[PDB]
Design an enzyme around this catalytic site. Structure first.
Site, PDB file in Angstrom:
ATOM      1  N   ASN A 172       0.973  -1.023   0.052  1.00 18.10           N
ATOM      2  CA  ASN A 172      -0.057   0.069  -0.065  1.00 18.10           C
ATOM      3  C   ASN A 172       0.902   1.321   0.208  1.00 18.10           C
ATOM      4  OD1 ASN A 172      -2.835   1.199   0.436  1.00 18.10           O
ATOM      5  ND2 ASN A 172      -2.031   1.746   2.267  1.00 18.10           N
ATOM      6  N   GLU A 239      -7.431   4.607   0.660  1.00 21.42           N
ATOM      7  CA  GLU A 239      -7.646   5.521   1.555  1.00 21.42           C
ATOM      8  C   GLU A 239      -8.052   7.066   1.009  1.00 21.42           C
ATOM      9  OE1 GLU A 239      -3.959   6.202   3.858  1.00 21.42           O
ATOM     10  OE2 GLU A 239      -3.697   3.760   4.025  1.00 21.42           O
ATOM     11  N   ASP A 241      -9.438  10.197  -0.219  1.00 20.65           N
ATOM     12  CA  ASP A 241     -10.025  11.526   0.138  1.00 20.65           C
ATOM     13  C   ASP A 241      -9.565  12.667  -0.923  1.00 20.65           C
ATOM     14  OD1 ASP A 241      -7.428  12.078   1.063  1.00 20.65           O
ATOM     15  OD2 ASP A 241      -7.762  11.595   3.155  1.00 20.65           O
TER      16      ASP A 241
END
Length: 320
Positions: A172, A239, A241
């Site tokens: 990741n 994740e 955003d």
């Protein structure tokens, strides 16, 4: 009519990291939206190395087990985040006296103990997180890299595969979504690991983007997903955003943000090897954005008062 219903219909899992208020029940509205709209959850900080092994050989599973129990009674899947990282390591580790052999033993004990406790219950694991230097020139210096050597990630993935052979193992990172130098360094790293028999199943695109993504940028993310499919690797958006400059006018900035979220979902729907869409929170009330990027904020799909923003409907429209 919830986001998880439309997502499920399309074979996509939609999720969010779970912020602190969940645990102490200080925000009932937070918990009510969480259990209703999402089909996947991830621990924001509770499964990091310092939280799980605070003292040498002492494991604290309290918070992680509490989230898993909630996930199970709500028909949700869970991602494990994260085993090996250069940040948030306990003082006993960072101040210890290690050599290659003794640190590999610590790595193996941490990975095996944590993964066997959750064996068969966590579908995707971020085995390693943010290990590539931002230049894309090579691995970042860290306690693991400096002490063990250049092959430390091969061991992390092998240990993980032995601990839970059914878990999908992920690397990741951020700024690896396009076709730039860091993205190319990560793709070649993963391709090489697989050619050497190292067990790695997926790549996690963090997706910490700035509001106003161009069509060309979005097009490069789609092409990058396709090259991972050619080497048999699955991609998860982990994740997401979309941060907005504090000075932009809110009303119109929210419309641009909604279109950016919509386009990201369309890319997920168009690629058979990308079926996990996780956002780093769901209400602008709780977000790490302002602390890391001062001057930016309002990155999520619900505002601070829990009113859905344009982005919420935009995602629902892409799913329909």
């Amino acid at each position: 009519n919830a986001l998880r219903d439309y997502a499920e219909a399309r074979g996509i899992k939609i999720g969010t990291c779970v912020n602190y208020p969940f645990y102490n029940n200080s925000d009932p509205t937070y918990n009510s939206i969480l259990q209703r709209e999402f089909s996947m959850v991830v621990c924001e900080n509770e499964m990091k190395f310092d939280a799980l092994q605070p003292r040498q050989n002492v494991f604290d599973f309290s918070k992680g087990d509490q989230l898993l129990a909630f996930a199970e009674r709500n028909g949700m899947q869970m991602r494990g985040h994260t085993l090996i990282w250069h940040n948030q390591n306990p003082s006993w580790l960072t101040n210890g006296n290690w050599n290659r052999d003794s640190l590999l033993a610590v790595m193996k004990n941490h990975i095996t103990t944590v993964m066997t406790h959750y064996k068969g219950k966590i579908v995707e694991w971020d085995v390693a997180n943010e290990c590539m230097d931002d230049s894309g020139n090579g691995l970042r210096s860290s306690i693991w890299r400096n002490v063990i050597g250049q092959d430390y990630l091969d061991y992390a993935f092998r240990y993980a595969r032995e601990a839970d052979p059914d878990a999908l193992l992920f690397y990741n990172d951020y700024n690896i979504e396009d076709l730039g130098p860091k993205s190319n360094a990560v793709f070649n790293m993963i391709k090489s690991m697989k050619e050497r028999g190292v067990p790695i199943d997926g790549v996690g695109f963090q997706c910490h983007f700035i509001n106003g993504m161009s069509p060309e940028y979005l097009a490069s993310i789609d092409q990058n997903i396709k090259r991972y499919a050619e080497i048999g690797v699955i991609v998860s958006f982990t994740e997401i955003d979309i941060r907005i400059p504090q000075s932009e006018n809110p009303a119109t900035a929210f419309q641009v943000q909604a279109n950016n979220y919509k386009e990201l979902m369309k890319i997920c729907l168009a690629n058979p090897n990308c079926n996990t869409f996780v956002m780093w929170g769901f209400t602008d009330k709780y977000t790490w954005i302002p602390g890391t990027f001062p001057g930016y904020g309002n990155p999520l799909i619900y505002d601070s008062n829990y009113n859905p923003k344009p982005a919420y409907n935009a995602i629902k429209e892409a799913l329909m």
